[PDB]
Ligand binder design. Structure first.
Ligand SMILES: Nc1ccn([C@@H]2O[C@H](CO)[C@@H](O)[C@H]2O)c(=O)n1
Ligand SMILES: Nc1ccn([C@@H]2O[C@H](CO)[C@@H](O)[C@H]2O)c(=O)n1
Ligand SMILES: Nc1ccn([C@@H]2O[C@H](CO)[C@@H](O)[C@H]2O)c(=O)n1
Ligand SMILES: [Mg+2]
Ligand SMILES: [Mg+2]
Ligand SMILES: [Mg+2]
Ligand SMILES: [Zn+2]
Ligand SMILES: [Zn+2]
Ligand SMILES: [Zn+2]
Lengths: 147, 157, 151
Protein backbone atom coordinates (compact mmCIF):
# COMPACT_ATOMS: atom_id res chain seq x y z
CA UNK A 1 0.00 0.00 0.00
CA UNK A 2 1.10 3.46 -0.79
CA UNK A 3 -0.29 6.63 0.58
CA UNK A 4 -0.27 10.08 -0.84
CA UNK A 5 -0.27 13.23 1.26
CA UNK A 6 -0.30 16.99 0.67
CA UNK A 7 0.56 19.99 2.76
CA UNK A 8 0.33 23.76 2.68
CA UNK A 9 1.42 26.54 4.96
CA UNK A 10 1.83 30.28 5.12
CA UNK A 11 3.25 32.97 7.34
CA UNK A 12 3.40 36.70 7.27
CA UNK A 13 6.58 38.69 7.47
CA UNK A 14 6.91 40.69 10.61
CA UNK A 15 9.39 41.87 13.19
CA UNK A 16 13.14 41.45 12.93
CA UNK A 17 14.91 38.61 11.15
CA UNK A 18 16.19 36.10 10.71
CA UNK A 19 13.87 33.36 9.69
CA UNK A 20 13.83 29.60 9.91
CA UNK A 21 13.21 27.43 6.86
CA UNK A 22 13.61 23.65 6.70
CA UNK A 23 15.38 23.91 10.05
CA UNK A 24 17.91 26.30 8.53
CA UNK A 25 18.59 29.71 9.99
CA UNK A 26 18.42 32.11 7.03
CA UNK A 27 19.47 35.72 7.26
CA UNK A 28 16.80 38.16 6.30
CA UNK A 29 15.85 41.83 6.87
CA UNK A 30 12.54 40.59 8.19
CA UNK A 31 11.18 37.96 10.54
CA UNK A 32 8.20 35.58 10.43
CA UNK A 33 5.15 36.28 12.59
CA UNK A 34 4.00 32.93 13.98
CA UNK A 35 2.74 31.21 17.13
CA UNK A 36 5.78 29.04 16.58
CA UNK A 37 9.24 29.35 15.01
CA UNK A 38 7.33 29.89 11.74
CA UNK A 39 9.06 27.24 9.69
CA UNK A 40 6.61 26.95 6.78
CA UNK A 41 8.59 24.24 5.04
CA UNK A 42 8.61 21.91 8.02
CA UNK A 43 4.89 22.64 8.67
CA UNK A 44 3.82 21.97 5.12
CA UNK A 45 5.88 18.78 5.29
CA UNK A 46 4.41 17.58 8.54
CA UNK A 47 0.85 18.13 7.35
CA UNK A 48 1.72 16.24 4.15
CA UNK A 49 3.12 13.34 6.17
CA UNK A 50 0.15 13.30 8.54
CA UNK A 51 -2.40 13.67 5.73
CA UNK A 52 -0.93 10.73 3.86
CA UNK A 53 -1.49 8.72 7.11
CA UNK A 54 -5.04 10.05 7.60
CA UNK A 55 -4.05 11.56 10.97
CA UNK A 56 -5.44 14.93 9.97
CA UNK A 57 -3.07 17.81 10.39
CA UNK A 58 -0.79 19.42 12.99
CA UNK A 59 -3.26 21.36 15.12
CA UNK A 60 -4.43 17.83 15.76
CA UNK A 61 -1.27 17.24 17.71
CA UNK A 62 8.06 26.00 19.54
CA UNK A 63 10.44 24.01 17.37
CA UNK A 64 9.08 22.85 14.02
CA UNK A 65 11.67 20.10 13.96
CA UNK A 66 10.34 18.65 17.21
CA UNK A 67 6.78 18.75 15.88
CA UNK A 68 8.03 17.03 12.70
CA UNK A 69 9.73 14.19 14.62
CA UNK A 70 6.73 13.78 16.93
CA UNK A 71 4.36 13.64 13.97
CA UNK A 72 6.72 11.15 12.36
CA UNK A 73 6.71 9.02 15.49
CA UNK A 74 2.91 8.75 15.48
CA UNK A 75 2.93 8.08 11.75
CA UNK A 76 5.43 5.22 12.11
CA UNK A 77 3.32 3.74 14.95
CA UNK A 78 0.44 3.36 12.47
CA UNK A 79 2.82 1.10 10.49
CA UNK A 80 4.06 3.49 7.83
CA UNK A 81 7.45 3.92 6.32
CA UNK A 82 8.87 6.72 4.22
CA UNK A 83 8.66 6.48 0.47
CA UNK A 84 9.77 9.97 -0.45
CA UNK A 85 9.10 13.62 0.01
CA UNK A 86 9.12 16.75 -2.13
CA UNK A 87 8.90 20.32 -0.82
CA UNK A 88 8.22 23.56 -2.65
CA UNK A 89 9.06 26.87 -1.01
CA UNK A 90 7.27 29.88 -2.47
CA UNK A 91 9.06 33.17 -1.78
CA UNK A 92 10.27 36.32 -3.49
CA UNK A 93 13.02 36.47 -0.87
CA UNK A 94 15.34 35.58 0.63
CA UNK A 95 17.23 33.27 -1.64
CA UNK A 96 16.59 29.66 -0.54
CA UNK A 97 18.82 27.88 -3.00
CA UNK A 98 22.11 27.91 -1.01
CA UNK A 99 20.28 26.47 2.00
CA UNK A 100 18.54 23.55 0.28
CA UNK A 101 21.25 20.94 1.02
CA UNK A 102 21.30 21.67 4.75
CA UNK A 103 17.51 21.67 4.86
CA UNK A 104 17.68 18.24 3.26
CA UNK A 105 20.21 17.05 5.81
CA UNK A 106 17.98 18.12 8.70
CA UNK A 107 14.79 16.67 7.23
CA UNK A 108 16.56 13.41 6.42
CA UNK A 109 17.73 13.19 10.03
CA UNK A 110 14.33 14.02 11.51
CA UNK A 111 12.68 11.37 9.26
CA UNK A 112 15.38 8.77 9.76
CA UNK A 113 15.80 8.49 6.02
CA UNK A 114 18.36 8.94 3.29
CA UNK A 115 18.85 12.29 1.67
CA UNK A 116 17.92 10.84 -1.69
CA UNK A 117 14.36 10.45 -0.46
CA UNK A 118 14.08 14.15 0.24
CA UNK A 119 13.64 16.92 -2.31
CA UNK A 120 13.40 20.62 -1.64
CA UNK A 121 12.77 23.42 -4.12
CA UNK A 122 12.13 27.09 -4.35
CA UNK A 123 10.22 29.35 -6.70
CA UNK A 124 9.08 32.94 -6.80
CA UNK A 125 5.72 34.23 -7.90
CA UNK A 126 7.48 36.87 -9.99
CA UNK A 127 6.43 39.73 -7.79
CA UNK A 128 2.78 38.64 -7.93
CA UNK A 129 0.41 38.07 -5.01
CA UNK A 130 1.19 38.26 -1.26
CA UNK A 131 4.48 36.33 -1.72
CA UNK A 132 5.34 38.61 -4.65
CA UNK A 133 4.71 41.77 -2.60
CA UNK A 134 7.00 40.37 0.07
CA UNK A 135 4.10 40.13 2.54
CA UNK A 136 4.87 36.58 3.38
CA UNK A 137 6.12 33.15 2.58
CA UNK A 138 4.35 30.01 1.56
CA UNK A 139 5.35 26.41 1.06
CA UNK A 140 3.64 23.35 -0.38
CA UNK A 141 4.76 19.74 0.23
CA UNK A 142 3.83 16.29 -1.03
CA UNK A 143 4.55 12.93 0.48
CA UNK A 144 4.53 9.26 -0.45
CA UNK A 145 4.18 6.67 2.34
CA UNK A 146 4.73 2.91 2.23
CA UNK A 147 2.84 0.36 4.38
CA UNK B 1 0.05 0.40 -11.69
CA UNK B 2 -0.53 3.43 -9.56
CA UNK B 3 -1.72 6.85 -10.47
CA UNK B 4 -1.25 10.23 -8.95
CA UNK B 5 -3.66 13.13 -9.17
CA UNK B 6 -4.05 16.77 -8.26
CA UNK B 7 -6.89 19.18 -7.97
CA UNK B 8 -7.57 22.78 -7.10
CA UNK B 9 -10.62 25.00 -6.82
CA UNK B 10 -11.75 28.45 -5.73
CA UNK B 11 -14.97 30.37 -5.03
CA UNK B 12 -15.83 33.87 -4.14
CA UNK B 13 -18.00 34.67 -1.13
CA UNK B 14 -21.26 36.37 -1.83
CA UNK B 15 -24.87 36.57 -0.87
CA UNK B 16 -26.18 34.84 2.22
CA UNK B 17 -24.80 31.67 3.71
CA UNK B 18 -24.63 28.99 4.55
CA UNK B 19 -21.94 27.35 2.55
CA UNK B 20 -21.38 23.77 1.42
CA UNK B 21 -17.95 22.26 1.92
CA UNK B 22 -17.23 18.58 1.53
CA UNK B 23 -21.01 17.99 1.30
CA UNK B 24 -21.50 19.63 4.67
CA UNK B 25 -23.79 22.57 5.26
CA UNK B 26 -21.77 25.05 7.30
CA UNK B 27 -23.27 28.17 8.81
CA UNK B 28 -21.65 31.39 7.84
CA UNK B 29 -22.49 35.09 7.37
CA UNK B 30 -21.81 34.85 3.64
CA UNK B 31 -22.54 32.44 0.82
CA UNK B 32 -20.52 30.89 -2.01
CA UNK B 33 -20.98 32.47 -5.45
CA UNK B 34 -21.08 29.55 -7.87
CA UNK B 35 -22.85 28.00 -10.88
CA UNK B 36 -23.20 24.95 -8.73
CA UNK B 37 -23.54 24.65 -4.95
CA UNK B 38 -19.94 25.89 -4.72
CA UNK B 39 -18.59 22.85 -2.89
CA UNK B 40 -14.97 23.80 -3.37
CA UNK B 41 -13.60 20.77 -1.55
CA UNK B 42 -15.56 18.14 -3.48
CA UNK B 43 -14.56 19.93 -6.69
CA UNK B 44 -10.83 19.94 -5.99
CA UNK B 45 -11.21 16.29 -4.93
CA UNK B 46 -13.10 15.38 -8.11
CA UNK B 47 -10.42 17.01 -10.25
CA UNK B 48 -7.59 15.22 -8.40
CA UNK B 49 -9.46 11.96 -9.04
CA UNK B 50 -10.23 12.48 -12.75
CA UNK B 51 -6.67 13.87 -13.07
CA UNK B 52 -5.04 10.70 -11.80
CA UNK B 53 -7.25 8.75 -14.26
CA UNK B 54 -6.38 10.99 -17.22
CA UNK B 55 -10.07 11.83 -17.72
CA UNK B 56 -9.33 15.57 -17.64
CA UNK B 57 -11.37 17.68 -15.18
CA UNK B 58 -14.82 18.62 -13.69
CA UNK B 59 -15.45 21.25 -16.29
CA UNK B 60 -15.02 18.93 -19.25
CA UNK B 61 -17.58 16.44 -17.97
CA UNK B 62 -19.87 19.15 -16.52
CA UNK B 63 -19.71 22.63 -18.21
CA UNK B 64 -20.48 26.02 -16.70
CA UNK B 65 -22.49 27.19 -19.70
CA UNK B 66 -25.10 24.45 -19.28
CA UNK B 67 -28.47 24.90 -17.50
CA UNK B 68 -28.65 21.33 -16.16
CA UNK B 69 -25.81 21.85 -13.65
CA UNK B 70 -27.32 24.96 -12.07
CA UNK B 71 -27.03 24.59 -8.28
CA UNK B 72 -25.85 21.04 -8.89
CA UNK B 73 -25.03 18.71 -6.05
CA UNK B 74 -21.21 18.45 -6.07
CA UNK B 75 -21.60 15.05 -4.39
CA UNK B 76 -23.50 13.91 -7.53
CA UNK B 77 -20.69 15.19 -9.76
CA UNK B 78 -18.26 13.32 -7.52
CA UNK B 79 -20.13 10.00 -7.66
CA UNK B 80 -20.48 10.17 -11.42
CA UNK B 81 -16.87 11.16 -11.83
CA UNK B 82 -15.94 8.20 -9.68
CA UNK B 83 -18.22 5.84 -11.60
CA UNK B 84 -16.34 6.73 -14.77
CA UNK B 85 -12.94 6.24 -13.11
CA UNK B 86 -14.02 2.74 -11.92
CA UNK B 87 -15.23 1.80 -15.39
CA UNK B 88 -11.68 2.49 -16.53
CA UNK B 89 -10.48 -0.20 -14.08
CA UNK B 90 -9.27 1.99 -11.27
CA UNK B 91 -9.66 1.58 -7.54
CA UNK B 92 -9.09 4.07 -4.70
CA UNK B 93 -5.73 4.26 -2.96
CA UNK B 94 -6.21 7.37 -0.85
CA UNK B 95 -7.16 11.03 -0.88
CA UNK B 96 -5.85 14.05 0.97
CA UNK B 97 -7.78 17.29 0.90
CA UNK B 98 -6.67 20.73 2.13
CA UNK B 99 -9.25 23.48 2.73
CA UNK B 100 -7.87 27.02 2.65
CA UNK B 101 -10.05 29.54 4.47
CA UNK B 102 -9.76 32.36 7.01
CA UNK B 103 -13.30 31.40 8.01
CA UNK B 104 -15.53 29.77 8.91
CA UNK B 105 -14.21 27.06 11.21
CA UNK B 106 -13.89 23.78 9.29
CA UNK B 107 -12.60 21.72 12.23
CA UNK B 108 -15.88 20.50 13.71
CA UNK B 109 -17.28 19.52 10.23
CA UNK B 110 -14.31 17.47 9.06
CA UNK B 111 -15.60 14.06 10.33
CA UNK B 112 -18.94 14.44 8.58
CA UNK B 113 -17.06 15.48 5.41
CA UNK B 114 -15.03 12.26 5.58
CA UNK B 115 -18.12 10.13 6.03
CA UNK B 116 -19.69 11.79 3.00
CA UNK B 117 -16.52 11.48 0.92
CA UNK B 118 -15.98 7.83 2.01
CA UNK B 119 -19.53 6.80 1.20
CA UNK B 120 -19.49 8.57 -2.20
CA UNK B 121 -16.18 6.86 -3.10
CA UNK B 122 -17.19 3.57 -1.54
CA UNK B 123 -14.11 3.51 0.67
CA UNK B 124 -13.23 3.34 4.35
CA UNK B 125 -12.88 6.71 6.13
CA UNK B 126 -9.21 5.94 6.90
CA UNK B 127 -8.60 6.39 3.21
CA UNK B 128 -9.78 9.91 3.37
CA UNK B 129 -7.99 12.85 4.97
CA UNK B 130 -9.39 16.33 5.22
CA UNK B 131 -7.58 19.25 6.73
CA UNK B 132 -7.87 22.92 6.97
CA UNK B 133 -5.68 25.89 7.12
CA UNK B 134 -5.63 29.64 6.90
CA UNK B 135 -3.29 32.01 5.10
CA UNK B 136 -2.88 34.21 8.19
CA UNK B 137 -4.88 37.08 6.65
CA UNK B 138 -2.68 37.04 3.55
CA UNK B 139 -3.98 37.16 0.03
CA UNK B 140 -7.54 36.69 -1.19
CA UNK B 141 -8.47 33.90 1.27
CA UNK B 142 -6.84 36.01 4.02
CA UNK B 143 -8.95 39.08 3.27
CA UNK B 144 -11.98 36.75 3.40
CA UNK B 145 -12.78 37.23 -0.29
CA UNK B 146 -13.23 33.53 -0.86
CA UNK B 147 -12.29 29.96 -0.22
CA UNK B 148 -9.73 27.70 -1.89
CA UNK B 149 -9.12 23.97 -1.85
CA UNK B 150 -6.44 21.64 -3.02
CA UNK B 151 -6.55 17.89 -3.16
CA UNK B 152 -4.24 15.05 -4.05
CA UNK B 153 -5.27 11.54 -4.89
CA UNK B 154 -3.81 8.16 -5.47
CA UNK B 155 -5.43 5.50 -7.60
CA UNK B 156 -4.74 1.83 -8.11
CA UNK B 157 -5.24 -0.71 -10.82
CA UNK C 1 9.80 1.80 -5.65
CA UNK C 2 7.40 4.60 -6.49
CA UNK C 3 8.33 8.27 -6.29
CA UNK C 4 6.20 11.37 -6.27
CA UNK C 5 6.89 14.93 -7.10
CA UNK C 6 5.37 18.35 -6.93
CA UNK C 7 5.87 21.39 -9.04
CA UNK C 8 4.75 24.98 -9.16
CA UNK C 9 5.25 27.92 -11.45
CA UNK C 10 4.09 31.42 -12.16
CA UNK C 11 4.61 34.14 -14.75
CA UNK C 12 3.45 37.65 -15.12
CA UNK C 13 1.62 39.18 -18.06
CA UNK C 14 3.48 41.68 -20.11
CA UNK C 15 4.38 42.75 -23.58
CA UNK C 16 2.47 41.47 -26.56
CA UNK C 17 0.92 38.05 -27.03
CA UNK C 18 0.69 35.27 -27.73
CA UNK C 19 1.63 33.05 -24.88
CA UNK C 20 3.09 29.54 -24.86
CA UNK C 21 1.51 26.89 -22.61
CA UNK C 22 2.19 23.17 -22.57
CA UNK C 23 4.16 23.86 -25.71
CA UNK C 24 1.11 25.30 -27.43
CA UNK C 25 1.04 28.74 -28.99
CA UNK C 26 -2.15 30.34 -27.61
CA UNK C 27 -3.51 33.65 -28.85
CA UNK C 28 -4.03 36.31 -26.34
CA UNK C 29 -3.92 40.07 -25.99
CA UNK C 30 -1.02 39.77 -23.62
CA UNK C 31 2.32 38.10 -23.42
CA UNK C 32 4.27 36.38 -20.64
CA UNK C 33 7.27 38.12 -19.04
CA UNK C 34 9.86 35.39 -18.63
CA UNK C 35 13.61 34.73 -18.81
CA UNK C 36 12.42 31.84 -20.93
CA UNK C 37 9.49 31.35 -23.33
CA UNK C 38 7.41 31.52 -20.13
CA UNK C 39 5.68 28.16 -20.40
CA UNK C 40 4.50 27.74 -16.79
CA UNK C 41 2.81 24.44 -17.49
CA UNK C 42 6.08 22.82 -18.68
CA UNK C 43 8.20 24.50 -15.92
CA UNK C 44 5.84 23.30 -13.22
CA UNK C 45 5.82 19.82 -14.79
CA UNK C 46 9.61 19.69 -15.08
CA UNK C 47 9.96 20.68 -11.42
CA UNK C 48 7.44 17.99 -10.44
CA UNK C 49 9.51 15.39 -12.34
CA UNK C 50 12.84 16.66 -11.01
CA UNK C 51 11.36 16.64 -7.52
CA UNK C 52 10.25 13.00 -7.69
CA UNK C 53 13.75 12.04 -8.86
CA UNK C 54 15.23 14.14 -6.05
CA UNK C 55 17.20 16.14 -8.66
CA UNK C 56 16.07 19.47 -7.17
CA UNK C 57 14.51 21.95 -9.60
CA UNK C 58 14.72 23.73 -13.01
CA UNK C 59 16.93 26.44 -11.53
CA UNK C 60 19.59 24.13 -10.09
CA UNK C 61 19.93 22.64 -13.59
CA UNK C 62 19.45 25.66 -15.83
CA UNK C 63 20.06 28.90 -13.90
CA UNK C 64 18.14 31.87 -15.17
CA UNK C 65 13.77 32.53 -24.95
CA UNK C 66 14.64 28.93 -24.10
CA UNK C 67 12.35 26.31 -25.52
CA UNK C 68 10.82 24.99 -22.33
CA UNK C 69 10.32 21.70 -24.15
CA UNK C 70 14.07 21.37 -24.57
CA UNK C 71 14.49 21.86 -20.81
CA UNK C 72 11.75 19.34 -20.16
CA UNK C 73 13.49 16.81 -22.44
CA UNK C 74 16.91 17.29 -20.89
CA UNK C 75 15.53 17.01 -17.38
CA UNK C 76 13.76 13.86 -18.35
CA UNK C 77 16.95 12.45 -19.83
CA UNK C 78 18.72 12.94 -16.52
CA UNK C 79 15.78 11.43 -14.64
CA UNK C 80 15.93 8.45 -17.00
CA UNK C 81 19.67 8.14 -16.47
CA UNK C 82 19.04 7.93 -12.74
CA UNK C 83 17.00 4.72 -13.21
CA UNK C 84 13.51 6.16 -13.49
CA UNK C 85 10.49 5.64 -15.63
CA UNK C 86 7.17 7.40 -16.01
CA UNK C 87 4.19 6.37 -14.02
CA UNK C 88 1.91 9.36 -14.71
CA UNK C 89 1.63 13.15 -14.67
CA UNK C 90 -1.12 15.57 -13.85
CA UNK C 91 -1.13 19.28 -14.57
CA UNK C 92 -3.26 22.09 -13.26
CA UNK C 93 -3.28 25.39 -15.16
CA UNK C 94 -4.57 28.35 -13.18
CA UNK C 95 -5.72 31.23 -15.36
CA UNK C 96 -8.68 33.63 -15.69
CA UNK C 97 -7.77 33.61 -19.35
CA UNK C 98 -7.13 32.77 -22.05
CA UNK C 99 -9.24 29.70 -22.52
CA UNK C 100 -7.01 26.63 -22.18
CA UNK C 101 -9.50 23.89 -22.85
CA UNK C 102 -9.28 23.57 -26.65
CA UNK C 103 -5.48 23.46 -26.57
CA UNK C 104 -5.35 20.73 -24.01
CA UNK C 105 -5.20 17.74 -26.42
CA UNK C 106 -2.22 19.23 -28.29
CA UNK C 107 -0.38 19.93 -24.97
CA UNK C 108 -0.79 16.32 -23.98
CA UNK C 109 0.50 15.32 -27.41
CA UNK C 110 3.61 17.46 -26.92
CA UNK C 111 4.27 16.32 -23.33
CA UNK C 112 3.80 12.59 -24.19
CA UNK C 113 6.15 13.10 -27.06
CA UNK C 114 8.74 14.89 -24.94
CA UNK C 115 8.48 12.25 -22.16
CA UNK C 116 8.40 9.28 -24.53
CA UNK C 117 5.13 8.09 -23.02
CA UNK C 118 1.61 7.28 -24.10
CA UNK C 119 -0.69 10.22 -23.61
CA UNK C 120 -3.09 8.43 -21.23
CA UNK C 121 -0.23 8.90 -18.79
CA UNK C 122 -0.59 12.68 -19.19
CA UNK C 123 -3.43 14.71 -17.76
CA UNK C 124 -3.85 18.44 -18.18
CA UNK C 125 -6.56 20.55 -16.57
CA UNK C 126 -7.49 24.19 -16.24
CA UNK C 127 -9.23 26.26 -13.60
CA UNK C 128 -10.13 29.85 -12.82
CA UNK C 129 -9.87 31.58 -9.44
CA UNK C 130 -13.15 33.38 -10.15
CA UNK C 131 -11.62 36.86 -10.48
CA UNK C 132 -9.81 36.38 -7.15
CA UNK C 133 -6.17 37.09 -6.52
CA UNK C 134 -3.40 37.93 -9.00
CA UNK C 135 -4.61 35.23 -11.44
CA UNK C 136 -8.14 36.56 -11.03
CA UNK C 137 -7.24 40.21 -11.74
CA UNK C 138 -5.49 38.99 -14.90
CA UNK C 139 -2.00 39.84 -13.58
CA UNK C 140 -0.64 36.42 -14.30
CA UNK C 141 -0.80 32.73 -14.92
CA UNK C 142 0.06 29.99 -12.46
CA UNK C 143 0.53 26.27 -12.83
CA UNK C 144 0.82 23.35 -10.49
CA UNK C 145 1.93 19.85 -11.34
CA UNK C 146 2.26 16.45 -9.73
CA UNK C 147 4.30 13.53 -11.01
CA UNK C 148 4.65 9.89 -10.19
CA UNK C 149 7.86 8.02 -11.13
CA UNK C 150 8.70 4.29 -11.11
CA UNK C 151 12.10 2.65 -10.54
N1 LIG D 1 -8.34 29.60 -18.16
C1 LIG D 1 -9.24 28.61 -18.22
C2 LIG D 1 -9.95 28.22 -17.10
C3 LIG D 1 -10.86 27.20 -17.20
N2 LIG D 1 -11.02 26.62 -18.37
C4 LIG D 1 -11.99 25.56 -18.54
O1 LIG D 1 -13.18 25.98 -17.90
C5 LIG D 1 -13.69 24.90 -17.11
C6 LIG D 1 -14.25 25.40 -15.79
O2 LIG D 1 -13.20 26.00 -15.01
C7 LIG D 1 -12.55 23.95 -16.85
O3 LIG D 1 -12.98 22.61 -17.03
C8 LIG D 1 -11.53 24.29 -17.90
O4 LIG D 1 -11.56 23.26 -18.88
C9 LIG D 1 -10.30 27.02 -19.48
O5 LIG D 1 -10.49 26.44 -20.56
N3 LIG D 1 -9.42 28.02 -19.39
N1 LIG E 1 -10.79 27.67 8.21
C1 LIG E 1 -10.15 26.98 9.15
C2 LIG E 1 -8.78 27.11 9.27
C3 LIG E 1 -8.12 26.39 10.26
N2 LIG E 1 -8.83 25.59 11.04
C4 LIG E 1 -8.16 24.87 12.10
O1 LIG E 1 -7.23 25.75 12.69
C5 LIG E 1 -5.93 25.18 12.71
C6 LIG E 1 -4.93 26.23 12.25
O2 LIG E 1 -4.47 25.95 10.93
C7 LIG E 1 -5.96 23.98 11.80
O3 LIG E 1 -5.35 22.84 12.41
C8 LIG E 1 -7.41 23.69 11.59
O4 LIG E 1 -7.74 22.60 12.46
C9 LIG E 1 -10.22 25.48 10.90
O5 LIG E 1 -10.87 24.74 11.64
N3 LIG E 1 -10.85 26.18 9.95
N1 LIG F 1 12.94 32.55 -2.76
C1 LIG F 1 13.57 31.89 -3.73
C2 LIG F 1 12.90 31.55 -4.90
C3 LIG F 1 13.57 30.87 -5.91
N2 LIG F 1 14.84 30.54 -5.70
C4 LIG F 1 15.59 29.83 -6.70
O1 LIG F 1 15.60 30.63 -7.87
C5 LIG F 1 15.26 29.84 -9.01
C6 LIG F 1 14.05 30.41 -9.71
O2 LIG F 1 13.15 29.32 -9.99
C7 LIG F 1 14.84 28.47 -8.54
O3 LIG F 1 15.71 27.47 -9.04
C8 LIG F 1 14.92 28.53 -7.04
O4 LIG F 1 15.69 27.41 -6.55
C9 LIG F 1 15.48 30.90 -4.51
O5 LIG F 1 16.66 30.60 -4.34
N3 LIG F 1 14.84 31.56 -3.54
MG1 LIG G 1 -0.99 28.26 9.65
MG1 LIG H 1 -12.91 25.67 -10.62
MG1 LIG I 1 9.57 29.39 -11.40
ZN1 LIG J 1 2.12 27.19 10.07
ZN1 LIG K 1 -15.49 25.17 -8.67
ZN1 LIG L 1 9.06 29.64 -14.87
Amino acid sequence: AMRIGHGFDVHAFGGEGPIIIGGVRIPYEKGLLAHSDGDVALHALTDALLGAAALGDIGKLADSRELLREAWRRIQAKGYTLGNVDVTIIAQAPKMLPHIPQMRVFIAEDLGCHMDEVNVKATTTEKLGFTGRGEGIACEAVALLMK
